[PDB]
């Protein structure tokens, strides 16, 4: 039961044509995280050609993938598998189904032990000069800057491995100061953008009482705040200073 079969059969979303693979990968001992069974230079697996390969937001391959991953004994779970090019570097699939736009597919992943903190770090991923796909690294911050409302409740708020507010990638950003980055003067863009700060804020406020999220700095030493500023983010800024002074005065 070679990649090549393998690859096919998740792309089509057929689970019937895996029967097989498990008594395979058993009698053989390989896992489907092993090097035969992903592509070389990126180590893609066969579950991120599934979430790849999603149809109105599923792939009736996943759950049996996932299942036979189990079964076949694997100590390193297909489930938390990771790109390890320097481009991709990271990306996995519970990120693909984030981008993919399925709350379906994510709630799949994160029921069968997705790890809800893996950094998706690759040069593709990182704030950079010019046009950016950069959104913070995490599969929060990913959904929040996606715009992704039923995405992040269900991050914040499952059972089984709840995202942390507080999590922060490579430059120290948290989820708000990812938010800050991508900020612009879109009038729809920004409203959404502000919208989102303000929804996660309130969803910490009951989650993490005790944490004032606004007051985390980055490596360089920068709250959200202040990142608005040095980054030139006008709109932002003012409504965290709105939020702050509104803040205060509700509590005095």
Request: charged share 20%; net charge negative.
């Amino acid at each position: 039961f070679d990649r090549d079969r393998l690859f096919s059969v998740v792309s089509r979303g057929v689970p019937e044509e895996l029967t097989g693979l498990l008594e395979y990968l058993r009698w053989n001992s390989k896992y489907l995280t092993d090097s035969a069974y992903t592509e070389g230079s990126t180590g893609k697996t066969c579950l991120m050609k599934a979430v790849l390969n999603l149809q109105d937001g599923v792939n009736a391959c996943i759950m049996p993938l996932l299942q036979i991953d189990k079964d076949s004994g694997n100590p390193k779970p297909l489930v938390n598998a990771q790109c390890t090019d320097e481009f991709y570097q990271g990306h996995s699939a519970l990120h693909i189904a984030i981008e993919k736009r399925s709350l379906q597919c994510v709630k799949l992943l994160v029921e069968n032990g997705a790890d809800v903190h893996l950094r998706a770090c690759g040069r593709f991923f990182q704030k950079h000069q010019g046009t950016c796909f950069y959104f913070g690294e995490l599969p929060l911050s990913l959904a929040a800057c996606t715009k992704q409302w039923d995405v992040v409740t269900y991050l914040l708020e499952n059972p089984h491995q709840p995202a942390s507010l507080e999590a922060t990638d490579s430059l120290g950003n948290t989820v708000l100061h990812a938010l800050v980055m991508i900020a612009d003067n879109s009038p729809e863009n920004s409203a959404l953008v502000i919208h989102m700060y303000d929804g996660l804020l309130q969803m910490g406020a009951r989650l993490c009482p005790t944490v004032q999220l606004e007051e985390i700095s980055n490596h360089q030493g920068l709250t959200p705040l202040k990142l608005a500023a040095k980054e030139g983010k006008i709109e932002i800024f003012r409504h965290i200073l709105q939020r702050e002074f509104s803040g205060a005065a509700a509590h005095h």
